[PDB]
């Protein structure tokens, strides 16, 4: 399952409300350097013929089809306070080794 934490959902709902117009979020993964992978997290106004759309806690999360299996299991979290305020990704099968 791709999911949002409660805080991530409440934050995201308040940006989508306050921005008025929209479909939802893209979740994505891209290359970063020669040995890294980086989560991609942005607003999208429509799904592409290449996406699958998931929905959790009322937000639509658009995910490219060729990355669906990779991204399965990720949870988007939001840390509301402190020096690491912001969005965060986790996945129980990717260990902090």
């Amino acid at each position: 399952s791709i999911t949002l934490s409660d805080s991530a959902a409440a934050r995201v709902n308040t940006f989508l409300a306050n921005r008025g117009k929209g479909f939802g979020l893209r979740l994505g993964v891209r290359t970063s350097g020669c040995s890294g992978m980086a989560y991609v997290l942005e607003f999208v106004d429509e799904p592409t013929p290449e996406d699958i759309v998931f929905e959790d806690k009322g937000v639509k999360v658009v995910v490219d089809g060729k990355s669906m299996q990779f991204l399965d299991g990720t949870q988007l979290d939001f840390v509301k306070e402190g020096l690491n305020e912001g969005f965060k990704f986790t996945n129980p099968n990717v260990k902090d080794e």
Copy 2:
């Protein structure tokens, strides 16, 4: 499955001779901060029962079963020359840029 290019296979077949010790390569993933992930590439002596072992051009590639969702269809590759000399990963689950 997992594969290796002719150049990566040739380099790793060499490293294997020169250390005459192990079973093959492990290919893994780990966390890299809260917004990404890094490849793990190492020599392993023995597989575990949690692993799925592929063999391509004489190199056994060992992958923990729970990491397959991140890695599957990946080609391990190698650039002989230039400033990016080294191993690199060509991963269909991951988008370029």
Copy 3:
């Protein structure tokens, strides 16, 4: 020197109250694999004699003297809203892209 924007200062002045414990922020650098570096941003209770302490809008910023070459002229910044919500660093020594 080191500075903070009005938004980052306001957020950090809050975090400071709410924990009523420390002296200010430490800004540092560390290694991030063999091809890069990461910012360190934390609360410190006491400076050391190795540090250079700046103060901007009521927040003491503590920097190890040997890290100044990486950090100097840096502004600590903060984005209240959107998917990049969080602290960010605006560092004149470092090029954008």
Copy 4:
């Protein structure tokens, strides 16, 4: 000092010979994500009005002026064999914390 290790110099000299034409390397540092910095390492055919040119072990290393202080102290190394073959950067004031 900005320096090249012996191996990095011999490797680099053999690419600049074999490529025939050139001035030297750029060393650079760029942003990477919201909390990362990435070394930039490429060939350049000329210095820009913005660069300072350094020379060590016979190779010209071109460095943007606004990044000179940041980059002071870095050594470019080259690992000739093993799974981490390739170029590498170090700096005694950036600890592997």
